[PDB]
Amino acid sequence: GMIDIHSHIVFDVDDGPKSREESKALLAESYRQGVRTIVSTSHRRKGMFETPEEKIAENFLQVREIAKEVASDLVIAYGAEIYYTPDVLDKLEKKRIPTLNDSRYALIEFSMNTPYRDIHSALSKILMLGITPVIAHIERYDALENNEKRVRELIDMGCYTQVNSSHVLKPKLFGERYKFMKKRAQYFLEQDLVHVIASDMHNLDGRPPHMAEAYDLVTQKYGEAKAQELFIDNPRKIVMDQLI
Ligand SMILES: [Mn+2]
Numbered sequence: 001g002m003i004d005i006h007s008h009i010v011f012d013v014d015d016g017p018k019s020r021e022e023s024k025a026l027l028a029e030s031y032r033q034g035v036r037t038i039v040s041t042s043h044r045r046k047g048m049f050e051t052p053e054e055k056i057a058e059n060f061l062q063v064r065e066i067a068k069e070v071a072s073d074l075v076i077a078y079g080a081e082i083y084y085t086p087d088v089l090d091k092l093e094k095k096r097i098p099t100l101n102d103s104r105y106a107l108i109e110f111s112m113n114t115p116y117r118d119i120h121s122a123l124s125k126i127l128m129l130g131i132t133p134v135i136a137h138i139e140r141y142d143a144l145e146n147n148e149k150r151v152r153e154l155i156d157m158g159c160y161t162q163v164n165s166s167h168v169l170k171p172k173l174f175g176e177r178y179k180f181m182k183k184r185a186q187y188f189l190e191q192d193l194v195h196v197i198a199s200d201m202h203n204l205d206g207r208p209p210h211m212a213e214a215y216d217l218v219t220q221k222y223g224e225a226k227a228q229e230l231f232i233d234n235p236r237k238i239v240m241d242q243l244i
């Protein structure tokens, strides 16, 4: 019954699945791990991911149909991962790019090196539209690294935070390629700065979901209540347009 609010499951629109078959296999693995609702958040990024909205929506509806071949109770909701450039304010205000399941929440991302002042300003402007930012993979941002302050100041302003399931996991004994991101994620969890864990799944090679492993790890380290909050209860509130 996990609810995954960050995913690249739509074929032929971004760096996610290339085909219907690949979308189906990604959905199947997500379901196998215990996920029961997935929010599609394919990339909207000026200068990198600019597939027309009409094509994303059309391919999304096909993916929702494919999900029925996986399981009758797998819920597929619409959404977007919005890389912040100033044109997105008008797109959001005019409802031309999607929020998460038509709620007040929008999934927002920045670059690794985006300065804190720019993150703060962008999020403030989005809040002024009546939209609540969910900050995508906060472990990515140099500006927030080891910085409980900064993260809390963003939260206190009205934002919520999301960390990728892959970075929740322990560093592996061999072949660890993402040690620093794991370490950042570990700090955010330890300081209780994380509202949601989501997969950011793209495929079944380099970027599969790690939702079941992350759920078990959080359960072990922080208890079942925190695990339920991060993987089920907070993401459900977002999907249902309820405040956290
Ligand atoms: Mn991507």
Ligand SMILES: [Mn+2]
Pocket: 081, 109, 136, 137
């Ligand atoms: Mn991203």
Ligand SMILES: [Mn+2]
Pocket: 006, 007, 008, 081, 200
């Ligand atoms: Mn993503």
